[PDB]
Nucleic acid binder design. Structure first.
Lengths: 200, 50, 40, 417, 417
RNA sequence: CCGCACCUCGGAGAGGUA
């Protein structure tokens, strides 16, 4: 049994930073990223471990598709024929499990992923506190000007974004300008949700 | 952040900004290793090879 | 027995037979990821 | 070529078959490995293999078809069920899956399901369209399950006393409260035999949890039915898993309009197991029981009910009191206010070798008029009014002397008037 | 030139032999070093070396042949067992392996095993083809083990009282509940002597774990059998390893159709050792007991059972109550609902110097009709009904005064009528 | 990682090669 990661997931957790599930998700995502950066021409490798005593196993997966794009991570429907073609397009999980490769140097990016997910959890806590103390017009500072989206800043490890369709068509913003906007909903964006703000 | 070093001190897992500075063999030259010497400063603990 | 006979047929045709296993399919995929064999 | 057929065969015939096929020495090998090698050699020829078992869907998505002979325990020869097959047929935990299987190929460790032929002992077309157990309208016990056989054996006296004290019907939810060394094993065996003889259509399931292996092998070789047991040598997690598998199978069978009866003499042991396997929450009630430890056994107990659309779920469990542990006392006091039938047994009468030592005064059945006629209810009321003044041992002696006069309770009631 | 024979000889004879052979000064050398040197010198001449011991497979795959005189303590001078021979002969932990050995070459530290000649003190052909203990059909206690000597000795009074209170048979799983300073040592010694005298075929085993060295050396020099012990000077891991080796040897003997009787006096100490060596799970029960701490001792206790195919395993443990620690009370309350025999001892009777101070009222055996005849059971029932109204001290005095009149209980039974 | 215990990638010098 891997007592090293077990002591970490048992001790560091339970302090509102690790909910016993996001910590395991971050650890398996970091292991997957390490295995991806280890191979040269083999991308999109995943790993799932959701048990204390149970060790982790690296099962490289392919993308089920009827085309030949990305020949390094694509598989055909004849491999799903064993399941009577039940594997619909858009879902990619099936393959034989291969040899796992654990190492102490792989913890470098693992710690980075862990602290990034802790920062994301702290951002979620700040969002919860904002919702607890919402109901007033706020001001924010823009950071970047992307396509059909801007950003807001309130320096308490918080952040907000405004959709361009909700803003004025004539007004274009620039970093350093204060923006007045009331937030109404938070959609679950990938790699962490973000508070969406609307003016119209 | 001083919290990450506490975590690094909690578990034995290595975590640092590793840069490669190993002694390599120059180009052209070759040969067979016939002797290896190791000198360690006083106080510092010796390693397996030493 | 030779790799040429297996490379003459596509991986989809090889997966359509119960004689091949999961480990064999994984090895074939790992060999084909290098663009050396099993390229249709 | 069936999995259970090859599993029920003895070791001698399997070793002989393996030696005739010309394989590695099967004497120093497990039965499961022998069956695995035989199935591999048979599938190499080209024939189809079939299997069966109750589905157990894990948290990751995949499922396993556990076998009945292993009391639904994780074995190496389990049938792997991919999540795609679960998504196609909308399978759930408890659904028996009897269909064509294949041996695990290179790199695999579990048998794969190629095509399902039978679902819950029925066609999959009838199982795809079914009414859930949560949608069934609950009602009181309507159909009477007369425990009295009427043959006239001395074993039928317990069933007769039970029928005269607390009648049991289809879907009845009762508790047999009894201190240790009261005679619960013999009473449970008599109940099972009476149910098997009088009502052979009712599926009988004797679930044992945290019991002795001698009692297990005595129960298995005595009753004519399916016996799922889990001795104390297994951890509480295995007990909880076996209980969940059994209750899921029972619910899935009831959903197919079947009369399932579960005789689990482990309600207190199951509560202890749940309290042991529950993570610590920092809030401990009186008796060492967690605030959420009793929720799962309370729901398991209350799951028993009578279905009007078809089928029934009868659960007759025995409880323990005066065990020297206050935890069992708190468990009994909490479970008393939940059910609607209590069968108390007296240790004082049991020490006198007077069976059945049933507390006739404290016994009773809620809404008993739905399982007994008006004249039968009046006769029971008269018997209660005659028995109540006498003492417990005196009442037992009176009942024994009265039942010794005739063979059936009908003649007794006719002669009493 | 066996290893056990050379280890049983005193140091003086070994030094004399080493000086006669013409080696270096052995006075300042260890006995094991003397054995190693004389084995090297004897193998130099060309003679073969033989050894034996019970196999102890490690986690890495290989194992060693430990000796019984050292409680299977890890030692640098033992018979190394390569994983190749383990895979070849299907060896497991507990198999007594005897065969030819050789001195270790340069770079080795253990004696290598070449060929096994005898397995479990039997032919290897009968040991390779056998039915495992997990496949043996369990049964209740059928055969009777009469502890009564019959020689009319004053020591036989304890055995007579035991047979009158709790008859013990082959495969019985009992418990000796007693407070500290009650007389468990003398009672266990008398039980061991009666077993060795009346039933020599039975394999008597005494496992005194976490006890005083004086009691160990007293037990070894008093009873006629094997006494494997582990004093408190050794860590709890030593206790766990000794218990594992003992239970594996017992299981192997039962599989070899042997009647093994294990007298355990450290069940509470073994449970404490398991609770100490278990990794922190994070959930603590009432009394400081871990969730997975009671699994191993409960399985060790439940291993005892009666085998119909041949042999039996009897385990009579001794419990500890009123020790001032609530952990022992919780352990006793948990293990009480597991066995089917309790032999309680009263401290009030022990304070009056009335030995043995056996609680006759709280004692008893379940399914005692399977170990005694009908008339014997009726006489025991009558004796209990006559004794029950009297007090414990008065009952013990009456029983002593009645048994003192004659030598055997048959005369007392004949005079009672 | 905060507290053990069950009642309703440079500069100088020396030597050498053509």
């Amino acid at each position: 049994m891997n007592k090293e990661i077990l002591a970490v997931v048992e001790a560091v957790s339970n302090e509102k930073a690790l909910p016993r599930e996001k910590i395991f998700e971050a650890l398996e995502s970091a292991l997957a990223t390490a295995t991806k950066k280890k191979y040269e021409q083999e991308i999109d490798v995943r790993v799932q471990i959701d048990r204390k005593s149970g060790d982790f196993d690296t099962f490289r997966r392919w993308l089920v598709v009827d085309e030949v794009t990305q020949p390094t991570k694509e598989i055909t429907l004849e491999a799903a024929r064993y399941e009577d073609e039940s594997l619909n397009l858009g879902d990619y999980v099936e393959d034989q499990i291969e040899s796992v490769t654990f190492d102490r140097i792989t913890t470098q990016t693992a710690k980075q992923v862990i602290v990034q997910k802790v920062r994301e959890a702290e951002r979620a806590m700040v969002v919860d506190q904002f919702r607890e103390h919402e109901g007033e017009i706020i001001t924010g500072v823009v950071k970047k000007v992307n396509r059909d989206n801007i950003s807001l800043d309130l320096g308490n490890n918080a952040e907000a974004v405004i959709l361009r369709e909700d803003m004025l068509p004539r007004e274009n913003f620039r970093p350093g300008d204060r923006v007045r906007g009331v937030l109404y909903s938070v959609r679950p964006e990938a790699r962490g949700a973000q508070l969406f703000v609307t003016r119209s | 952040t001083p919290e990450e070093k506490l975590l690094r001190a909690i578990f034995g897992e290595k975590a640092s900004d590793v840069k490669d500075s190993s002694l390599r063999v120059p180009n052209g030259v070759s040969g067979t290793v016939i002797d290896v010497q190791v000198f360690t400063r006083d106080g510092v603990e010796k390693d397996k090879r030493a | 027995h030779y790799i040429g006979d297996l490379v003459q047929r596509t991986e989809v045709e090889l997966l359509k037979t119960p004689n091949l296993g999961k480990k064999s399919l994984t090895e074939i995929k790992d060999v084909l990821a290098s663009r050396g064999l099993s390229l249709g | 070529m069936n999995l259970t057929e090859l599993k029920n065969t003895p070791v001698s015939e399997l070793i002989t078959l393996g030696e005739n096929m010309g394989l590695e020495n099967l004497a120093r090998m497990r039965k499961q490995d022998i069956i695995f090698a035989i199935l591999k050699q048979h599938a190499k020829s080209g024939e189809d293999i079939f299997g069966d078992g109750v589905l157990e869907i894990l948290q990751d998505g995949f499922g396993f078809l556990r076998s009945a002979d292993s009391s639904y325990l994780a074995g190496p020869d389990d049938i792997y069920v991919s999540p795609s097959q679960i998504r196609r047929f909308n399978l759930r935990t408890g659904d028996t899956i009897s269909g064509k299987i294949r041996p695990p190929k290179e790199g695999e460790r579990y048998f794969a399901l190629l095509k399902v032929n039978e679902v819950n002992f029925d066609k999959p077309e009838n199982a795809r369209n079914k009414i859930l157990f949560e949608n069934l309208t609950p009602l009181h016990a309507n159909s009477r399950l007369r425990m009295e056989r009427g043959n006239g054996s001395t074993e039928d006296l317990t069933a007769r006393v039970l029928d005269l004290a607390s009648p049991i019907g289809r879907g009845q939810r009762g508790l047999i409260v009894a201190p240790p060394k009261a005679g619960k094993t013999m009473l449970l065996q008599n109940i099972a035999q009476s149910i098997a003889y009088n009502h052979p259509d009712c599926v009988l399931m004797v679930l044992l949890i945290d019991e002795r292996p001698e009692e297990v092998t005595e129960m298995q070789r005595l009753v004519k039915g399916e016996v799922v047991a889990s001795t104390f040598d297994e951890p509480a997690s295995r007990h909880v898993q076996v209980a969940e598998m059994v209750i899921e199978k029972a619910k899935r069978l009831v959903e197919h309009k079947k009369d399932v009866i579960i005789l689990l003499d482990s309600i207190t042991r199951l509560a202890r197991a749940y309290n042991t396997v529950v993570p610590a929450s920092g809030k401990v009630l009186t008796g060492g029981v967690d605030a959420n430890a009793l929720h799962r056994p309370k729901r398991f107990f209350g799951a028993a009910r009578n279905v009007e659309e078809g089928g029934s779920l009868t659960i007759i469990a025995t409880a323990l009191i005066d065990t020297g542990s206050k935890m069992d006392e708190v468990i009994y006091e909490e479970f008393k206010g939940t059910g609607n039938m209590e069968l108390h047994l007296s240790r004082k009468i049991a020490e006198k070798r007077v069976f059945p030592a049933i507390d006739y005064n404290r016994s009773g059945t809620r809404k008993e008029e739905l399982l007994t006629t008006q004249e039968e209810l009046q006769k029971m009321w008269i018997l209660r009014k005659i028995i109540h003044p006498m003492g417990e041992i005196d009442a037992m002696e009176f009942l024994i002397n009265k039942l010794a006069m005739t063979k059936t309770n009908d003649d007794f009631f006719e002669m009493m008037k």
